[PDB]
Tab-separated table of C-alpha atoms and ligand atoms in Angstrom:
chain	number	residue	atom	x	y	z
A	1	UNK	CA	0.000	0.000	0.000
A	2	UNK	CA	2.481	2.993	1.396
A	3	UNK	CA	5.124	3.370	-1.035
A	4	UNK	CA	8.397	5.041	0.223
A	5	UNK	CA	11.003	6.417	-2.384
A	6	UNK	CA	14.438	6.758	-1.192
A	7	UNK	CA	17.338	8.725	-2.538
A	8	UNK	CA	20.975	7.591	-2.488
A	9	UNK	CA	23.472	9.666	-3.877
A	10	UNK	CA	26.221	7.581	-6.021
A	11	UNK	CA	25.969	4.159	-7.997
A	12	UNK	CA	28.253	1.447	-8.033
A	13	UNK	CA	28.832	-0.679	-4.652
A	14	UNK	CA	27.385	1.598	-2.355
A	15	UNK	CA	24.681	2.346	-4.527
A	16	UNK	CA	23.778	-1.519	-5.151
A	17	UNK	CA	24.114	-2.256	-1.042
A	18	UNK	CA	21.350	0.431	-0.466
A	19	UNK	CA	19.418	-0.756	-3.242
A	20	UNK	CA	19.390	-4.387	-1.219
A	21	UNK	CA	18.782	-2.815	2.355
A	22	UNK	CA	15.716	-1.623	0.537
A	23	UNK	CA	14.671	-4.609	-1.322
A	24	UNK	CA	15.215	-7.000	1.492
A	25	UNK	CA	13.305	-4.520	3.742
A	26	UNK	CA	10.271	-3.832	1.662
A	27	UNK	CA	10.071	-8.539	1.579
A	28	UNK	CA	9.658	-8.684	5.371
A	29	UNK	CA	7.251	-5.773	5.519
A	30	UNK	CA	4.584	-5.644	2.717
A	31	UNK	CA	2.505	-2.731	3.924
A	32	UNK	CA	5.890	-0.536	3.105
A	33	UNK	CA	7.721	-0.897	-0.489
A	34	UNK	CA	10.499	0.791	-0.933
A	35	UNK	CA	11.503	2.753	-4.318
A	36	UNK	CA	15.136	3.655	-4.165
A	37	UNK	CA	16.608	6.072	-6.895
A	38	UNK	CA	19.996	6.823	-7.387
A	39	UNK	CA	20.046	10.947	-7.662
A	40	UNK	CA	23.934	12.135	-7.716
A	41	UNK	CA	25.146	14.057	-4.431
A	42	UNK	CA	21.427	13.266	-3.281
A	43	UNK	CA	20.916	16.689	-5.546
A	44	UNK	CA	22.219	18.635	-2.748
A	45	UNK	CA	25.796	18.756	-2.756
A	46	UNK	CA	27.627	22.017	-3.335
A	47	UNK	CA	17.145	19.212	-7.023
A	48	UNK	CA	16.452	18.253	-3.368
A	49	UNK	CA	15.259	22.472	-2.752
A	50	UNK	CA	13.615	22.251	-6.014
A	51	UNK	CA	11.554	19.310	-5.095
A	52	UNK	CA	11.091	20.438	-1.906
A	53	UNK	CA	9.761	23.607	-2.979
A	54	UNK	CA	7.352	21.855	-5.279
A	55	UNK	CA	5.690	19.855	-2.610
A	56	UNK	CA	7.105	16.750	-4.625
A	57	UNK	CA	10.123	15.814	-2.431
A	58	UNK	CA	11.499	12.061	-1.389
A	59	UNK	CA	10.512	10.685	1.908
A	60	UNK	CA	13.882	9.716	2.873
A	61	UNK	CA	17.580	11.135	1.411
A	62	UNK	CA	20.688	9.559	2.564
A	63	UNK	CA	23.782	12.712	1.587
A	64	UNK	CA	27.464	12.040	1.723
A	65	UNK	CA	28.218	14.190	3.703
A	66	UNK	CA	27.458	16.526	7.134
A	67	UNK	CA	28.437	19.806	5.428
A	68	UNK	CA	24.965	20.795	3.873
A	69	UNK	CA	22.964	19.980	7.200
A	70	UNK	CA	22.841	23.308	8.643
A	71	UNK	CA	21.904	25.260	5.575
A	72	UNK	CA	18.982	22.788	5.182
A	73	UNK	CA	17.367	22.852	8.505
A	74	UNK	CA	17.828	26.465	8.568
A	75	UNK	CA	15.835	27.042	5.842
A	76	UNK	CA	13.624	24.179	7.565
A	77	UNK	CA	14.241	22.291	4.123
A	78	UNK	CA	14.386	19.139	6.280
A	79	UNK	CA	12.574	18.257	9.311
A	80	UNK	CA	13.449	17.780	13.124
A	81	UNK	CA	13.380	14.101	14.605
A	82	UNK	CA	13.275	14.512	18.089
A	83	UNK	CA	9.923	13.047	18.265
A	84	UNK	CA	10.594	10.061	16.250
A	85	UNK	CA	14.146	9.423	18.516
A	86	UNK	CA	12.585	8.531	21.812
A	87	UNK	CA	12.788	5.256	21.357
A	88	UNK	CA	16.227	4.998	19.603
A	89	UNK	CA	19.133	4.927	22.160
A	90	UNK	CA	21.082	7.478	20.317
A	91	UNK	CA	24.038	6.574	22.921
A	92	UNK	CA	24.384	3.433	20.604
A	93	UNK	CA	26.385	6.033	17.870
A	94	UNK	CA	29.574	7.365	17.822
A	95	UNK	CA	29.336	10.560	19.456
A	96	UNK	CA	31.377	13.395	17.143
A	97	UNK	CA	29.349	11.167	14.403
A	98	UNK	CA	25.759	11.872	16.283
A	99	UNK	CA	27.101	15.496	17.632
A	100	UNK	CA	27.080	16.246	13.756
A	101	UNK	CA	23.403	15.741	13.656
A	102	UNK	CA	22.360	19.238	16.215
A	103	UNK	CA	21.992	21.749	14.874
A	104	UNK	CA	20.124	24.927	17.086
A	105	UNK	CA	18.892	22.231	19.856
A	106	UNK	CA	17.209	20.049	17.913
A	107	UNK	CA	18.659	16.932	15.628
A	108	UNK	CA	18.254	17.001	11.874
A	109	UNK	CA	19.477	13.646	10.532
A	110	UNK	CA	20.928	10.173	11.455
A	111	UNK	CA	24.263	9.383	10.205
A	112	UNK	CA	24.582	6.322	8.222
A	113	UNK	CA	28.243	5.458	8.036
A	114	UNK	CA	31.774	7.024	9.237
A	115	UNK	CA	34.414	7.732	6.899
A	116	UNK	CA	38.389	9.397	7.393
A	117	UNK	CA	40.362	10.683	4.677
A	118	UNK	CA	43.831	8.833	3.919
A	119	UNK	CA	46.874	9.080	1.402
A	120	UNK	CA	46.750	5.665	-0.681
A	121	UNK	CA	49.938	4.791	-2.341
A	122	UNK	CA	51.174	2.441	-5.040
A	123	UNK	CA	53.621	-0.082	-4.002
A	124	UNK	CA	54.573	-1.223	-7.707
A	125	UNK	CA	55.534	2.581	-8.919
A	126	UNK	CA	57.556	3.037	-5.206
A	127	UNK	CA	59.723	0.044	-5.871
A	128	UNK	CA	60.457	1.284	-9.249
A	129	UNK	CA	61.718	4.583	-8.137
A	130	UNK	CA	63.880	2.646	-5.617
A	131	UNK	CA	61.059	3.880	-2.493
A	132	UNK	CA	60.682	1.754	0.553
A	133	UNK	CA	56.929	0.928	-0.267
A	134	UNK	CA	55.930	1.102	3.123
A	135	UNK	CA	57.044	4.094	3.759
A	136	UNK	CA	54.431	6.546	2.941
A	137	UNK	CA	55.995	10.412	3.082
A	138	UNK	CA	55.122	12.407	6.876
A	139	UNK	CA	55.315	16.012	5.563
A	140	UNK	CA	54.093	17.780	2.793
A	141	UNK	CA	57.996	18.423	1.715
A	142	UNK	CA	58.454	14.903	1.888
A	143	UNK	CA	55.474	14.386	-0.326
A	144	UNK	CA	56.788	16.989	-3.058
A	145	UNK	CA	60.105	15.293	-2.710
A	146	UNK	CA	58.827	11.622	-3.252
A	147	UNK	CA	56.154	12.813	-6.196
A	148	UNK	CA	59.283	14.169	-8.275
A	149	UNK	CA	61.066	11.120	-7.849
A	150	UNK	CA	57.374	9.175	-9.176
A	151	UNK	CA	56.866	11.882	-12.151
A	152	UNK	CA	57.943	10.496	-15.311
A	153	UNK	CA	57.316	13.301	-18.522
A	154	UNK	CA	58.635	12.838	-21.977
A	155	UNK	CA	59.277	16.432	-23.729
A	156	UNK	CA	56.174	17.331	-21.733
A	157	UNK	CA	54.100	14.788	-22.231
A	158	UNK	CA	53.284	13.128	-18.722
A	159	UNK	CA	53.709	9.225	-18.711
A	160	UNK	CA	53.503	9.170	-14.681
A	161	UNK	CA	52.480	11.318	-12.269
A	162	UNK	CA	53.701	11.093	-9.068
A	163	UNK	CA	51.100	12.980	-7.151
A	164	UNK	CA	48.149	15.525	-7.880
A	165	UNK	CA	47.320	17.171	-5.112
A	166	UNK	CA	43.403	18.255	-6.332
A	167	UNK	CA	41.881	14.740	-7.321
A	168	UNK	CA	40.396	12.222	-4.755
A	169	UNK	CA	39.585	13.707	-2.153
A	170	UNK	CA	42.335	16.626	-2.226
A	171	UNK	CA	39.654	19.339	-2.198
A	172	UNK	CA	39.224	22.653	-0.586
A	173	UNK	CA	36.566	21.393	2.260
A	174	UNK	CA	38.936	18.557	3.076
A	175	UNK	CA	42.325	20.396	2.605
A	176	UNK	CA	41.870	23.266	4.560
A	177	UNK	CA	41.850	20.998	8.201
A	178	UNK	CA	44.921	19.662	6.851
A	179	UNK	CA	46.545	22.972	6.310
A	180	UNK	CA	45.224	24.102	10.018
A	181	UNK	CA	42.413	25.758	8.713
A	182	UNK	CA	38.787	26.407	7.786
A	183	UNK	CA	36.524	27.901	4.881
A	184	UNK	CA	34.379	29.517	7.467
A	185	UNK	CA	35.088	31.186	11.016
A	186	UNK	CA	33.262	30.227	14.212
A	187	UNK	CA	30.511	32.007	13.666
A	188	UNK	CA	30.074	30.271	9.914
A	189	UNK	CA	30.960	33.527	7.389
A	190	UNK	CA	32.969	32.401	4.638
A	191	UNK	CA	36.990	32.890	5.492
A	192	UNK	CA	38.602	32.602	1.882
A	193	UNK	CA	41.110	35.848	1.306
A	194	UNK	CA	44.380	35.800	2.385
A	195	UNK	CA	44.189	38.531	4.746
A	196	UNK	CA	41.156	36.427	6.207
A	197	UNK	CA	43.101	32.992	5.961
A	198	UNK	CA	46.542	32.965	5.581
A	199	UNK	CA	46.921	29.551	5.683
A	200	UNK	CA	44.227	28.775	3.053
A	201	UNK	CA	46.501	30.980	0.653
A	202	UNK	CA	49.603	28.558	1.803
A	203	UNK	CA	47.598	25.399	0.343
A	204	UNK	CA	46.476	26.787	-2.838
A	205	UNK	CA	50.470	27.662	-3.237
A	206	UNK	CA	51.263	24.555	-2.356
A	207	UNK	CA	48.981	23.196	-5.026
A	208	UNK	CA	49.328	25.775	-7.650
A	209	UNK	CA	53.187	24.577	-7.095
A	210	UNK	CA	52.263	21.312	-9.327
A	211	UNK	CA	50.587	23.131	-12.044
A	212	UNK	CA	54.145	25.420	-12.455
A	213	UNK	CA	56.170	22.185	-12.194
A	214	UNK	CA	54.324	19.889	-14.956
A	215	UNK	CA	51.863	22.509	-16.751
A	216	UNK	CA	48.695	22.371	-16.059
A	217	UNK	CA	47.607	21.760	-19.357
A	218	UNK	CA	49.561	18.487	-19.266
A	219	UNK	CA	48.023	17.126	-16.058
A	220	UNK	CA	44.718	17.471	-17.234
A	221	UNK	CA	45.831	16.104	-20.616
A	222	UNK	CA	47.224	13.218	-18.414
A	223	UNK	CA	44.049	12.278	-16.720
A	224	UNK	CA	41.550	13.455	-19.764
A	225	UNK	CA	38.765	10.505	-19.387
A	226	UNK	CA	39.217	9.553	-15.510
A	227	UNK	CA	37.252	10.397	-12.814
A	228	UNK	CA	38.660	12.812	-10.293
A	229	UNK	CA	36.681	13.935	-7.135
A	230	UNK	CA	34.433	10.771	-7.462
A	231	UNK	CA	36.224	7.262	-6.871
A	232	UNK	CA	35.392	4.899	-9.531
A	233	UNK	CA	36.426	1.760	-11.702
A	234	UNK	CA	37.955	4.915	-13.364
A	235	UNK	CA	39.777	7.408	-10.813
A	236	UNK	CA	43.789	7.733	-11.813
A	237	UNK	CA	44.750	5.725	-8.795
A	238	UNK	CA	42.797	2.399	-9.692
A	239	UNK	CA	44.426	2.971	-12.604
A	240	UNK	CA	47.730	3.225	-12.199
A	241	UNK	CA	48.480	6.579	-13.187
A	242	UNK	CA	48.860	8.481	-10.419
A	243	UNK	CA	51.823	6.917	-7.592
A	244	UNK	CA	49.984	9.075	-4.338
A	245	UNK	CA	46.440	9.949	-3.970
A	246	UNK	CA	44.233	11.131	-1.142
A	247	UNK	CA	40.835	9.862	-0.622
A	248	UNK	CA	38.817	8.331	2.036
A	249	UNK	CA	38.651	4.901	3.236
A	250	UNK	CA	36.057	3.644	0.633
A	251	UNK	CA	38.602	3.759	-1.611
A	252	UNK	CA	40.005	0.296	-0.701
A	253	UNK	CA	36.783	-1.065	-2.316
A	254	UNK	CA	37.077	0.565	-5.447
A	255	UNK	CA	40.951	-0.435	-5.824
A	256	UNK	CA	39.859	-4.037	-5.045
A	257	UNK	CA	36.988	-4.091	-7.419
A	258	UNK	CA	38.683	-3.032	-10.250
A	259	UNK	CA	42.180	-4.326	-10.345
A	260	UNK	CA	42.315	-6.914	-6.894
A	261	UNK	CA	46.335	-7.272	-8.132
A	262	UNK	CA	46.816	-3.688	-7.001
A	263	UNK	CA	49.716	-3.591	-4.783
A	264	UNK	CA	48.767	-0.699	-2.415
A	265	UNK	CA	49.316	1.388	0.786
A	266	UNK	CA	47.120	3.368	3.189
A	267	UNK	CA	48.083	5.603	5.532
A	268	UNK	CA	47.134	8.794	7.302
A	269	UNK	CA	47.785	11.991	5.207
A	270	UNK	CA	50.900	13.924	5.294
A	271	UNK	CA	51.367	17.023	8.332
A	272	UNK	CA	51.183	20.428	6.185
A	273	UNK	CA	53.134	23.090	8.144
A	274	UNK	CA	50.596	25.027	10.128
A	275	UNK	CA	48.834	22.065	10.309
A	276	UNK	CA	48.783	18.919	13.037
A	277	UNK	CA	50.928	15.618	12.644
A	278	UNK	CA	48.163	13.027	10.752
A	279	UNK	CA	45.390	15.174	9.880
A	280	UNK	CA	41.971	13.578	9.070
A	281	UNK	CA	39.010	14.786	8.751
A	282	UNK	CA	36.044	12.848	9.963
A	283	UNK	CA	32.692	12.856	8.588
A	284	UNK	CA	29.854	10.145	7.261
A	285	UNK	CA	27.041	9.969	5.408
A	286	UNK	CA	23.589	11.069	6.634
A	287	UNK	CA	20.043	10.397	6.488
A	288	UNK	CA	17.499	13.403	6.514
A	289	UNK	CA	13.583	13.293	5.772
A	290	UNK	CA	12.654	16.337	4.195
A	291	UNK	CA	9.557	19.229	4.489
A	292	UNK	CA	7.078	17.326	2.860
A	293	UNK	CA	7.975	13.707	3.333
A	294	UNK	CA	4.471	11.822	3.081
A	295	UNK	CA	5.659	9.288	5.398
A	296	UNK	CA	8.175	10.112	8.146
A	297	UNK	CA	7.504	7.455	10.553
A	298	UNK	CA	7.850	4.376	7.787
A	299	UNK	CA	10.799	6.191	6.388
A	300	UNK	CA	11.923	6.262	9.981
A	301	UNK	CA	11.395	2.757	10.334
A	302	UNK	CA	13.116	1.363	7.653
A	303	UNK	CA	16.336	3.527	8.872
A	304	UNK	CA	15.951	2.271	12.430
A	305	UNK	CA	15.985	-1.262	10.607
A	306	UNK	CA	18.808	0.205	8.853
A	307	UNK	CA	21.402	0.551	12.057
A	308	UNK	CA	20.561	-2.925	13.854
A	309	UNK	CA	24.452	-4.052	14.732
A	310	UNK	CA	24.770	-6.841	12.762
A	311	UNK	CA	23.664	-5.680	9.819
A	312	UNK	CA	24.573	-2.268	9.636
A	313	UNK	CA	27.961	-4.063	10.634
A	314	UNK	CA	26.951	-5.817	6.864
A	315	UNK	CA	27.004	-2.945	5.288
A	316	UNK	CA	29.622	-1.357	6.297
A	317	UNK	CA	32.021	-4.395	5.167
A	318	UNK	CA	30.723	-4.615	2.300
A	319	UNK	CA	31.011	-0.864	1.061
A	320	UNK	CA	34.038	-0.479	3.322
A	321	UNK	CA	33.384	2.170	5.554
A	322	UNK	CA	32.919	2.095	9.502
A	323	UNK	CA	29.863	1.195	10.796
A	324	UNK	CA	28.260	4.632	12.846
A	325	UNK	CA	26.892	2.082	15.538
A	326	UNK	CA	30.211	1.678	18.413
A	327	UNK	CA	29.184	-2.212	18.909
A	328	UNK	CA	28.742	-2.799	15.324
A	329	UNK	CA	32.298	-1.180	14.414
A	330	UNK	CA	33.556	-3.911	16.896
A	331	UNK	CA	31.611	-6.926	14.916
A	332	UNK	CA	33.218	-5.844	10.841
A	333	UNK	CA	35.034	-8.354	9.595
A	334	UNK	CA	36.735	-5.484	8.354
A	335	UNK	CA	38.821	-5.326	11.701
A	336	UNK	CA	40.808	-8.277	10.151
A	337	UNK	CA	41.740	-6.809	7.301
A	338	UNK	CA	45.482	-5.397	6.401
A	339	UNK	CA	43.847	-2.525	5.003
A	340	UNK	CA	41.500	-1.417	6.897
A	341	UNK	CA	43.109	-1.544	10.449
A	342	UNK	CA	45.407	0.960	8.592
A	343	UNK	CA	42.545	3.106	8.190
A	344	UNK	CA	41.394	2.469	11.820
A	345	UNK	CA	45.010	3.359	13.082
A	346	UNK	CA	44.123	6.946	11.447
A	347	UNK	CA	41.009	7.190	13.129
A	348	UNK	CA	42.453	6.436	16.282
A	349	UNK	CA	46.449	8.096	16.229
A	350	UNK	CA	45.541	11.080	13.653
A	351	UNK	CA	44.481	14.393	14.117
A	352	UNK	CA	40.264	14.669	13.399
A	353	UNK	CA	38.759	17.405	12.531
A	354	UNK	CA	34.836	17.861	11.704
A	355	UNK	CA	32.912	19.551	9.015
A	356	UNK	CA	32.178	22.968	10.278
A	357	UNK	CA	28.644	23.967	11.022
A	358	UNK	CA	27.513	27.279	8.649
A	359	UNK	CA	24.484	27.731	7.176
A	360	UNK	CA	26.101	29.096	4.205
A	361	UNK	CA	28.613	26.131	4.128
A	362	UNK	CA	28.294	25.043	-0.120
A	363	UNK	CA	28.017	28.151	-1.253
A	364	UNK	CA	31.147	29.754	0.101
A	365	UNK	CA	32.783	25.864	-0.903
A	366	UNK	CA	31.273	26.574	-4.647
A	367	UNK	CA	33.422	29.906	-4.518
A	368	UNK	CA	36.310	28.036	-2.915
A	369	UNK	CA	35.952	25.455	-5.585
A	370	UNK	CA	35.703	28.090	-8.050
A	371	UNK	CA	38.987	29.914	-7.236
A	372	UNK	CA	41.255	26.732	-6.754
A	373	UNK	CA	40.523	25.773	-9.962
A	374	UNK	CA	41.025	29.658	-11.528
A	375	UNK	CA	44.387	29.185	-9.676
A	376	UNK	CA	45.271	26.101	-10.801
A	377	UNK	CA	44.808	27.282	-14.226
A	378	UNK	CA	47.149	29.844	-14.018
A	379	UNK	CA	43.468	32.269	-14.971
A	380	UNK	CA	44.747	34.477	-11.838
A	381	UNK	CA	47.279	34.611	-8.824
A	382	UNK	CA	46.325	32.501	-6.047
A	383	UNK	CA	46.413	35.639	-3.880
A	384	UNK	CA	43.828	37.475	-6.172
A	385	UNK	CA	41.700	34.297	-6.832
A	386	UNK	CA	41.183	34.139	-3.083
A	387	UNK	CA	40.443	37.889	-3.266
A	388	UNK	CA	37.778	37.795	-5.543
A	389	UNK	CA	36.203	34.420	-3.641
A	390	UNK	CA	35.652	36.224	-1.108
A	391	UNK	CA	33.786	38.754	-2.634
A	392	UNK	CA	31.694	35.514	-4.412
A	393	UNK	CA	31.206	33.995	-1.439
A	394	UNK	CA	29.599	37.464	0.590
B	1	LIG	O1	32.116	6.401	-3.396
B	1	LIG	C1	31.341	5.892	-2.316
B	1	LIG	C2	31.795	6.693	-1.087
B	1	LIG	O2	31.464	8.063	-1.321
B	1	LIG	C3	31.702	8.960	-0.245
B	1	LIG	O3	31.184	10.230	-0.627
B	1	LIG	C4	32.062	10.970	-1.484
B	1	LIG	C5	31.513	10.975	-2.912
B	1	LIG	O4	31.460	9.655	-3.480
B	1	LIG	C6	32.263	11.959	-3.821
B	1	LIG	O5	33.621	11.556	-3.990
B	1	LIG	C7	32.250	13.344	-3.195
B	1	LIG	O6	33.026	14.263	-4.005
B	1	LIG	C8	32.472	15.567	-4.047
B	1	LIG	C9	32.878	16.390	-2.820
B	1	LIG	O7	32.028	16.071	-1.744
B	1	LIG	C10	32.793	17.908	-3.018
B	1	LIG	O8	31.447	18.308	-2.897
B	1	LIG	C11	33.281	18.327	-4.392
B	1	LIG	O9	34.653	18.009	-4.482
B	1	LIG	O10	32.579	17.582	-5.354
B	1	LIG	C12	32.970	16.231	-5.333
B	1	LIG	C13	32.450	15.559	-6.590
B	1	LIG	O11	31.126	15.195	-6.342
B	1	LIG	O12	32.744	13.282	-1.848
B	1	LIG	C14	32.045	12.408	-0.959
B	1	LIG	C15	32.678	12.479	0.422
B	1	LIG	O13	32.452	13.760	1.008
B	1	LIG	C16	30.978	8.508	1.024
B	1	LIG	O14	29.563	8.593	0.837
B	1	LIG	C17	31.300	7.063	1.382
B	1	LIG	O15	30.424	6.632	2.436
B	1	LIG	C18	31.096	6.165	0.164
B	1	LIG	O16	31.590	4.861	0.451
B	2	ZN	ZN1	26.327	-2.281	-9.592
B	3	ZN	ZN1	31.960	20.325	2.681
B	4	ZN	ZN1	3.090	6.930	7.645
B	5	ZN	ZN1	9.710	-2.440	10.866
């Protein structure tokens, strides 16, 4: 009778594991089917507003992030839960994971998974250029040091790149922390000059640094066809292109899944100066029911299905990511794995940071976005790029 449609926002894996939570939970209760449709960044990331606005809107959205969850319930574009939660012992969760969920004293969404941001690197293309392959590079100088040695250009032409330091998950929003830093101040008004943030200037120069070495025009000759801030059967490091990547833990999965002979290395991300020894953010994926949801406490019910320990435990194996539920991150499988207790050694040794709570959090990012790229391009100076973000982002 009650149908419930669902939006999850990538394909692949993760996409087919939600899919199946749905499925297998619309079997066991017939009075609720489930319609799950893939809609990219959950048509929210930096057509959820425009639904919304039309009175048309999904019952349920599961985002990829934390970041837009202010902005949102601000504009009361999703609605509070505290009267669907009395029965959920919310002291189950992780706490910085459920702490992300308040936002002015009531909670907003559920988070779904945990993730951490690490540097993968390619054992193979280290042993070639004489590097100890497991011994991943501690500083930023270190890093630029290594990725020279892992660069291999012919008259220009890039055969092998040792590092690029925008792709993966080597954007703005995630690069900032690592520089000691954030796009917006404690009160959440977008930070981006250089006389605002002097340290956000230092990490575009880092990273404008690698467009003057190789030409930017090469690197993006070099990766023309891959994917670059989405990890796919198609990103530069699952291909073997790039020697040094960062990404988040997830990305284990996709190097498996497309080339399982992968010889490969995680570790926490290199210290940037101003920044803290192993910086990581953490964040996770979240589910929020929107203004308008015909069906709250059924799309309530299939996420409170959604975090029983064992089989959110399940799912977080299988897409590799860590379970949001502290008893259920005990029971993964994934605890046995090389890999991933690599990952949870970040979690646990590195420096976390959290997404920052603005409500004008993805557009100041868009302007952020904007002027890296400018930058990168050589378009404009990173000092005046930043400048004139700033002015974008007011
Ligand atoms: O791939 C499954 C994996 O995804 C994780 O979410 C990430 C997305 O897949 C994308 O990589 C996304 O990239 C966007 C950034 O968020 C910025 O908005 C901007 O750079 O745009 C890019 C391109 O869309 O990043 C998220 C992580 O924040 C996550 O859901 C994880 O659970 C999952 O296994
Ligand atoms: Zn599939
Ligand atoms: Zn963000
Ligand atoms: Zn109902
Ligand atoms: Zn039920």
């Amino acid at each position: 009778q009650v149908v419930l449609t669902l939006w999850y926002p990538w394909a692949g894996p993760d996409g087919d594991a939600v899919v199946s939570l749905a499925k297998e939970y619309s079997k066991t209760h017939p009075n609720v089917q489930i319609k799950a449709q893939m809609v990219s960044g959950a048509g929210i990331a930096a057509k959820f507003l425009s639904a919304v606005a039309a009175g048309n809107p999904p019952d349920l959205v599961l985002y990829w992030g934390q970041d837009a969850l202010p902005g949102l319930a601000d504009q009361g574009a999703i609605i509070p839960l505290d009267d669907y939660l009395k029965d959920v012992d919310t002291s189950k969760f992780f706490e910085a994971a459920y702490n992300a969920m308040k936002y002015k004293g009531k909670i907003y969404g559920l988070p779904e998974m945990v993730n951490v941001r690490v540097l993968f690197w390619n054992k193979d293309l280290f042993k070639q250029a004489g590097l100890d392959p497991n011994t991943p590079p501690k500083t930023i100088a270190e890093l630029d040091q290594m990725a020279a040695k892992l660069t291999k250009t012919k008259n220009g032409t890039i055969e092998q790149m040792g590092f690029i330091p925008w792709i993966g998950q080597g954007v703005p929003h995630v690069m900032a922390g690592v520089f000691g830093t954030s796009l917006v101040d404690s009160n959440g008004n977008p930070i981006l000059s250089p006389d605002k943030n002097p340290q956000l200037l230092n990490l575009l120069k880092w990273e404008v640094s690698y467009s003057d070495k190789y030409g930017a025009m090469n690197i993006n000759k070099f990766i023309a066809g891959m994917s670059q801030n989405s990890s796919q059967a198609n990103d530069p490091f699952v291909l073997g292109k790039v020697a040094m990547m960062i990404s988040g833990e997830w990305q284990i999965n996709a190097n498996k899944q497309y080339n399982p002979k992968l010889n490969f290395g995680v570790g926490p991300i290199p210290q940037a100066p101003g920044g803290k020894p192993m910086p990581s953010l953490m964040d996770g994926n979240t589910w929020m029911i929107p203004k308008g949801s015909k069906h709250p406490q059924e799309a309530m019910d299939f996420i409170k299905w959604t975090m029983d320990p064992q089989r959110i435990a399940d799912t977080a194996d299988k897409v590799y990511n860590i379970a949001p539920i502290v008893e259920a991150a005990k029971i993964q499988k994934l605890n046995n794995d090389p890999y991933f207790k690599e990952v949870l050694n970040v979690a646990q040794k590195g420096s976390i940071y959290y997404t920052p709570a603005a409500k004008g959090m993805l557009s100041t990012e868009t302007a952020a976005n904007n002027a890296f790229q400018a930058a990168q391009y050589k378009k404009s100076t990173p000092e005046q790029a930043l400048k004139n973000a700033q002015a974008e982002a007011e």
